[PDB]
Amino acid sequence: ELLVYMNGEFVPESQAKVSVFDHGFLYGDGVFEGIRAYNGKVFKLYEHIDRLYDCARVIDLKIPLSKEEFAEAILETLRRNNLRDAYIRPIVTRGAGDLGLDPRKCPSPNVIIITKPWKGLKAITVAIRRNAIDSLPPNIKSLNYLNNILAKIEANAKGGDEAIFLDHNGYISEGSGDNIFIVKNGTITTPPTLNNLKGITRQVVIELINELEIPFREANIGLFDLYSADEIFVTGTAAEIAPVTYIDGRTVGNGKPGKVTKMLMEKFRERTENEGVEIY
Amino acid sequence: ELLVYMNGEFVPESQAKVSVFDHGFLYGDGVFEGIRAYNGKVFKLYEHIDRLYDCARVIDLKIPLSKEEFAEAILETLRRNNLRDAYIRPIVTRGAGDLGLDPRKCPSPNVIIITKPWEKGLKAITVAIRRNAIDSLPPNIKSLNYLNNILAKIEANAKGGDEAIFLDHNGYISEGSGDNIFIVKNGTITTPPTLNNLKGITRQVVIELINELEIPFREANIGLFDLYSADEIFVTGTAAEIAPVTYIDGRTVGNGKPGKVTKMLMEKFRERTENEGVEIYR
Amino acid sequence: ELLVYMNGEFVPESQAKVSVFDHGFLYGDGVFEGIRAYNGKVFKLYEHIDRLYDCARVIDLKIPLSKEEFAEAILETLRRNNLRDAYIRPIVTRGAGDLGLDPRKCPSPNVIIITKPWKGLKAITVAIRRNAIDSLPPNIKSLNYLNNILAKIEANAKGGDEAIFLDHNGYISEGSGDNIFIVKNGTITTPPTLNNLKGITRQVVIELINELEIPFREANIGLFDLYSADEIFVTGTAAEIAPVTYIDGRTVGNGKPGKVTKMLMEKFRERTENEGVEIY
Amino acid sequence: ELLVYMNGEFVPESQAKVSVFDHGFLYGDGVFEGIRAYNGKVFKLYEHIDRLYDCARVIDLKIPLSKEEFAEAILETLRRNNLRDAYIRPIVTRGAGDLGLDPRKCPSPNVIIITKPWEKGLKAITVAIRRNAIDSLPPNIKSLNYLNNILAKIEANAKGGDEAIFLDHNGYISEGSGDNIFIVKNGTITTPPTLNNLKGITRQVVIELINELEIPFREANIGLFDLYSADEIFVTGTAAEIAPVTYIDGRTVGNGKPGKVTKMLMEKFRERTENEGVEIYR
Amino acid sequence: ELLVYMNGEFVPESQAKVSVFDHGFLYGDGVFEGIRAYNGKVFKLYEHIDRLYDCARVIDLKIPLSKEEFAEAILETLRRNNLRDAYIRPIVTRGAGDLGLDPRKCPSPNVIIITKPKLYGDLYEKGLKAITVAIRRNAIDSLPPNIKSLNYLNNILAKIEANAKGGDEAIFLDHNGYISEGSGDNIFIVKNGTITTPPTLNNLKGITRQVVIELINELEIPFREANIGLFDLYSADEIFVTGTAAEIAPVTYIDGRTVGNGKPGKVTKMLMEKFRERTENEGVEIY
Amino acid sequence: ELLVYMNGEFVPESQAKVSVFDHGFLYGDGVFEGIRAYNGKVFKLYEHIDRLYDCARVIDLKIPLSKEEFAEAILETLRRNNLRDAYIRPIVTRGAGDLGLDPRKCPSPNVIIITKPKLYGDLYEKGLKAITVAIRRNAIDSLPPNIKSLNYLNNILAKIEANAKGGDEAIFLDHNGYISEGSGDNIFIVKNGTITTPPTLNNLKGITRQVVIELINELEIPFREANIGLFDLYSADEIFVTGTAAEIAPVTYIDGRTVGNGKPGKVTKMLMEKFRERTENEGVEIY
Ligand SMILES: *Cc1c(COP(=O)(O)O)cnc(C)c1O
Ligand SMILES: *Cc1c(COP(=O)(O)O)cnc(C)c1O
Ligand SMILES: *Cc1c(COP(=O)(O)O)cnc(C)c1O
Ligand SMILES: *Cc1c(COP(=O)(O)O)cnc(C)c1O
Ligand SMILES: *Cc1c(COP(=O)(O)O)cnc(C)c1O
Ligand SMILES: *Cc1c(COP(=O)(O)O)cnc(C)c1O
């Protein structure tokens, strides 16, 4: 049985439980990460940690471990589970307090680390818009994911593998759990991150694009751009690079993964084979 | 030790815990209520349950109890704890599934019920952060995604406020971080339409009291100009009841003491909580 | 073969054609109506005419017939086709001018009248928003219907019989071609018309609701209201009252037409049997 | 008499007519282009066709000609009319179907090609009506729904303007009613990003000329403040080419005469239309 | 020479000047009113004063006079100039401070009251030609339009558009595309015998507007306070605007378009006559 | 007593007054500048003048002085008061007209120049405590924030919030939720060694801001002009604001939250020192 890190103890999965009084559970008042181990090494471990700490700062939550201790803890929980290929979900919550909202009454944050062993998508645009930048900033990878879940429920009902959000301005934002890229006449465009999330996989992809010297723009786009694109793909830690071959039932290109997307998938695979922090 | 209802079992508080795999924890993927018991009667029990079932429907969650069984579970939890004056927090979550978002992989929801035992105004401040928008995370869902509200509270804590007041994206007043808002100006009471806030049970009772008293009343969008020129402000909710707001953004509301109308509504509300409700021990 | 009214001539359907230089065709620069004849009488003929003329005024288009002459023309084209149960599509365009946009160069509007013989809907909310009140006012029943068509294309791809628009504020607007009503705990709500279209069928329905003394509100609503509604229906000249029994795959009530909706359908049917202008 | 291309036939202008059942007429359900021929060569023929096919794809319309065949049809229509200096208007519509909206009932699109034979600035005015929004009726589609643009022109006609200037809902400058917009301020040229307007072929040529001349250039959102303080303004499009704007909202732009930079771009553009294009008679 | 009230002193017009350091001047940091005297009586004097004090409260400015003392000051300045028919402009400013924004550094508000002695033209025959402006009304959460403040550049910019674009009157929309008001007057429309006017939130809670609604309800004309848009303006049977200085002004053309027959409408004309009657029959006696 | 330039005359401060009928006073209808003299030299004098003339053009106001005559007037008013270190406030107003809004009825603008003799405190140690305000910045299509106008009540309202809410400095968002600026200073952030500042569209095209970007590019610090939001502010390593009066001011706390260690950051401190050097080495000689 896999062990979960809970505040420094390793607890079997079936017994890994949090107080119902934890503000993480009552109010989604916490932050989280998603990280992959490939063949014994943790891909972009430090970058993910840095984002976690930034998100914690945004919600005014003090993580009770230094960054190095957090990295050790992630590594120790993979070893304890004897994992080499894994998805890792670190979570930091506000902890318990009074029953109300007030985070000043919550003296002890809680730290959890879950480790689990490890043709394109039909995407649909959803009616629901992404969380606004001045209500629930979407750059926060928080435990408030019901915006994302409502979009997923739409896609499930409407013939889609993946939901695509616009923002309130009508700009394309992202998928429900992944950043979005388009290819047109050989130029790649992706939205600026402000209205979506500063994806680590997106950042790797951009480095690859610039190394391949493929023309690239970070620019807001709309429905006209999605429906006229030669290729679409989405990016994220779990999905990696995933081709999107239909959009609202419309065929993208010939309906199979495009040339630029398949090229980047191969380069991305190479980076995951060659980089990372050693677990053992 | 108080006991927590958990899927039909009564569990000591200290051991009342949920799987870290529950999407309620992972994603705030659930709904909740807040209910008061006053001297052995639950106030507005059925209006709370009905709202819970509406919010669950909006997030496409089937609660695995009939409404009648939910009512019985709440009353039984109160009884097991010997409570007569209490605050009650029902929660329903999506339960566990895959580690990803998709609620279709979540076969079994969790039902939890927490019971706890139970003139100067509030100083309010308006916050920079806007209310969750009606086409992103509709504020009418009393869900476990409460970081909008907590972000507002963090502002109020830093800015000298007991209560944070939200605007929406249009610039319309919305509500407090956990309470609806009313103003009084030249004998007329105005409160925002519920669309950009939440359909409060307390707010509804108060409208009823207003209409009994024949005080002129409007449900209409308002802005900062209205807050800053009001004769009285108050907020409403299950825990706070009716709470006068005596300062706004450091500005004195009337004479800084609770206003004539607010006080009259406070008295009438107290009478309702004394005289109506569902009896726990019967 | 059915005849079409074209500027006072009656022209067989197969030869009923408009100059490609008509600004109606080049730029959708015209207005239109939809009207039903039931058993020899034209339902709300004068109301539809009045709306046509209001829409023409909004686009600064002078209709070259008085209102009475327009009514005569509609009646004459139904008689000429010997119709008793019909859909009528009157259309007024800018006419031809210079090839550019300028309506001042277009001296002669064109008047066309088409007459054709005559479980709920699964509705889906669409990603595209309704035309804005200060860009292309949706109260104009104009020949610019591509907003409406793009929504229809979404619904067709996404498992829907009917598309439902929000506006830019997130408020519910209407269906792609019909007004929307909801029923909850016995109260009926419909949006104010500003962000949709002042439907004649909607107006009849409201009169019926007030005669049945059913609690009613004209109030903006959102997704929360649609997904928690006991009943939904849409209204329009062609559709009449149409029950909506699914919304984004979610069951409305028991998945069959609700009690209040079926009651109004029966009352509406009675009004169409008893009112109208006689054709013969 | 000039002939119009209509689904492969060449029809005298006076008899070139489409079914009143065509959704192009009923609902403006189609796309169009605008193209110039200069001294027996078509300027930017392929960039126009490519845009037509993009706009058709966005409205989910399959044009029943390959791009190469469309190019041949345009050139043949010009030849049949003996034209050398011309304005060309290709149109593709959805064709006829049911009388209702649904494009699935429309089996056969219509292809039409119209050919016509072919220093003081414009007075511009800003209009009240905003540009069609990017998530309602995306302005980048050169569709037959042009009433947004005609409403603007009606304003300009009533308000003393040769050209109407749109803002978008954010308050950003968008474009003219049928032309893109550029400003010049202290030696730098700025033009809006295309998202809230239309990806003009003329605008693209002009950016190329700007970059050849090494004049500092920005693609950036601008507002009224920028228009009202500009040293020069000009608009661009196939019919107008580069048109100086010498007044804005009655305010004089520079000295009221076309500006130094605008004039230099006008000369360079004229050279391109003289020297590049697809030959009609070859 | 007319006298201007200036903090209790009465100063000839030509000498009535304020320090260049008054934040009223530097920053538009103050509030104002517009009130009319008709035939020796001040119309809605106490209502205008109540609004002044609310606007002041909104900008966190304490007016150093009781409401009753302000009413006496207005009446006194009228008497000292011997006026029977007049327009009155009370102004309260923040006063002088440091050069910076901060109102805490400003100890002493200035109170000024200007008093000055109807538009030429047969308003039963000839209305205003209105244009809708590109600029939008100041937003309810940036510079709330309900404040009758010295910040009137939004309003002046709209007037400049109108001046340039062949209008006598500028009409604002708000950011939502809802009709707001004219540059200085609330707006009403009439359609199929029903009168509509926007809620006041996006414009200003006009006292003339309020009087007109009272007259409307007396006449039993169907009435709606609702948001409206361009479609409503362009299809209206009648349009008029309202405010203290101009009273009820018909709008007979909008953005080119003829309203009705291009003359003031029947409803408008009836309201104009009733309003003028109202101004003869009510008011606070100056003498 | 210091003298104030007033349409060519030099008037002692205490006598420097403007008519209550000047539309500058009634309506905030005018434009201004803020310029500093350091050690006998005026810093970016011609740039400030160019901005004044652009703001005037935006509000359709013709300044009745050539740019060169305006430069001489500023220099002259400094010399007449014998200043070496000073803050200069040129103002141009619409002038007097009729009582109404209409700027056509206003024949004669007023030109005023105020000249007055650094914030107390170790700015290498102690920064500003900033709060984000509920009120949004004036919108780009209602009252364009790029205009340095006499309509500063949006800015004063934000300051009032800050005063009440424990801030030294108010920070505005715009209607889109993008960070705009402080109430009177542009804003910069620093994160992982990259500096970001908003495009000027939703705020004001600051001259201090422009100087700072020049210094940044000299230092080869990575730099982005991009929109940003609350997430960016709350996670920034450093924050500072910029403007003529305050120069470069570190912001060490935002809405409760400690920025870095609560002291001015390394990048900020380097820019402050370089900026001060710049102000010693450039400028138009007064004498
Ligand atoms: C985690 C996440 C992403 C992608 O981030 P990576 O760092 O590539 O895994 C994108 N969007 C949302 C909403 C997410 O939660
Ligand atoms: C629960 C709640 C309310 C008010 O609810 P009552 O039903 O009166 O307890 C108001 N606003 C928010 C955000 C809430 O969560
Ligand atoms: C015609 C129309 C309606 C309904 O109008 P009726 O007068 O009931 O037929 C609603 N919405 C749209 C978009 C329409 O075109
Ligand atoms: C066609 C068009 C343009 C400019 O196009 P060119 O391709 O340069 O002819 C600009 N705006 C609108 C609205 C248009 O229809
Ligand atoms: C004063 C004013 C009005 C009209 O108010 P009255 O009280 O009727 O004089 C309307 N709009 C604006 C902007 C105003 O300043
Ligand atoms: C003057 C001003 C600035 C700063 O500009 P500087 O030219 O650097 O003095 C920034 N914001 C506002 C609102 C201002 O008035």
PDB file of N, CA, C and O in Angstrom, chain F residues 175-189:
ATOM      1  N   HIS F 175     -10.786  48.642 -14.979  1.00  0.00           N
ATOM      2  CA  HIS F 175     -12.062  47.883 -15.052  1.00  0.00           C
ATOM      3  C   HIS F 175     -11.854  46.435 -15.429  1.00  0.00           C
ATOM      4  O   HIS F 175     -12.639  45.585 -15.056  1.00  0.00           O
ATOM      5  N   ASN F 176     -10.813  46.179 -16.173  1.00  0.00           N
ATOM      6  CA  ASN F 176     -10.421  44.780 -16.567  1.00  0.00           C
ATOM      7  C   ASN F 176      -9.760  43.996 -15.454  1.00  0.00           C
ATOM      8  O   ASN F 176      -9.584  42.776 -15.593  1.00  0.00           O
ATOM      9  N   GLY F 177      -9.456  44.644 -14.350  1.00  0.00           N
ATOM     10  CA  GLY F 177      -8.726  43.963 -13.252  1.00  0.00           C
ATOM     11  C   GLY F 177      -7.212  44.036 -13.445  1.00  0.00           C
ATOM     12  O   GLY F 177      -6.450  43.399 -12.693  1.00  0.00           O
ATOM     13  N   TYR F 178      -6.750  44.847 -14.402  1.00  0.00           N
ATOM     14  CA  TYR F 178      -5.301  45.037 -14.607  1.00  0.00           C
ATOM     15  C   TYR F 178      -4.834  46.084 -13.609  1.00  0.00           C
ATOM     16  O   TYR F 178      -5.534  47.055 -13.340  1.00  0.00           O
ATOM     17  N   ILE F 179      -3.645  45.886 -13.052  1.00  0.00           N
ATOM     18  CA  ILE F 179      -3.010  46.941 -12.274  1.00  0.00           C
ATOM     19  C   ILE F 179      -2.824  48.179 -13.188  1.00  0.00           C
ATOM     20  O   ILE F 179      -2.477  48.029 -14.366  1.00  0.00           O
ATOM     21  N   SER F 180      -3.145  49.355 -12.643  1.00  0.00           N
ATOM     22  CA  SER F 180      -3.009  50.635 -13.318  1.00  0.00           C
ATOM     23  C   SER F 180      -1.755  51.397 -12.824  1.00  0.00           C
ATOM     24  O   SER F 180      -0.739  51.458 -13.544  1.00  0.00           O
ATOM     25  N   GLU F 181      -1.881  52.004 -11.630  1.00  0.00           N
ATOM     26  CA  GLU F 181      -0.856  52.829 -11.032  1.00  0.00           C
ATOM     27  C   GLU F 181      -1.244  53.145  -9.615  1.00  0.00           C
ATOM     28  O   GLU F 181      -2.406  52.838  -9.132  1.00  0.00           O
ATOM     29  N   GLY F 182      -0.340  53.846  -8.941  1.00  0.00           N
ATOM     30  CA  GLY F 182      -0.739  54.560  -7.717  1.00  0.00           C
ATOM     31  C   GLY F 182      -1.577  55.779  -7.979  1.00  0.00           C
ATOM     32  O   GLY F 182      -1.716  56.214  -9.075  1.00  0.00           O
ATOM     33  N   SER F 183      -2.054  56.431  -6.938  1.00  0.00           N
ATOM     34  CA  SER F 183      -2.925  57.578  -7.095  1.00  0.00           C
ATOM     35  C   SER F 183      -2.266  58.722  -7.809  1.00  0.00           C
ATOM     36  O   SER F 183      -2.945  59.528  -8.492  1.00  0.00           O
ATOM     37  N   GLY F 184      -0.944  58.771  -7.702  1.00  0.00           N
ATOM     38  CA  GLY F 184      -0.164  59.791  -8.435  1.00  0.00           C
ATOM     39  C   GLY F 184       1.196  59.376  -8.973  1.00  0.00           C
ATOM     40  O   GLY F 184       1.959  60.221  -9.266  1.00  0.00           O
ATOM     41  N   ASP F 185       1.473  58.098  -9.186  1.00  0.00           N
ATOM     42  CA  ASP F 185       2.776  57.558  -9.538  1.00  0.00           C
ATOM     43  C   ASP F 185       2.575  56.244 -10.267  1.00  0.00           C
ATOM     44  O   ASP F 185       1.684  55.428  -9.875  1.00  0.00           O
ATOM     45  N   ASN F 186       3.358  56.006 -11.292  1.00  0.00           N
ATOM     46  CA  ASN F 186       3.347  54.786 -12.011  1.00  0.00           C
ATOM     47  C   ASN F 186       3.923  53.675 -11.129  1.00  0.00           C
ATOM     48  O   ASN F 186       4.601  53.977 -10.146  1.00  0.00           O
ATOM     49  N   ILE F 187       3.632  52.415 -11.440  1.00  0.00           N
ATOM     50  CA  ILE F 187       4.077  51.280 -10.636  1.00  0.00           C
ATOM     51  C   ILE F 187       4.923  50.284 -11.403  1.00  0.00           C
ATOM     52  O   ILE F 187       4.674  49.995 -12.571  1.00  0.00           O
ATOM     53  N   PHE F 188       5.975  49.766 -10.736  1.00  0.00           N
ATOM     54  CA  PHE F 188       6.843  48.760 -11.281  1.00  0.00           C
ATOM     55  C   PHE F 188       6.901  47.592 -10.313  1.00  0.00           C
ATOM     56  O   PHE F 188       6.817  47.774  -9.122  1.00  0.00           O
ATOM     57  N   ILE F 189       7.048  46.407 -10.837  1.00  0.00           N
ATOM     58  CA  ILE F 189       7.358  45.262 -10.002  1.00  0.00           C
ATOM     59  C   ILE F 189       8.640  44.601 -10.439  1.00  0.00           C
ATOM     60  O   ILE F 189       9.024  44.720 -11.602  1.00  0.00           O
TER      61      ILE F 189
END
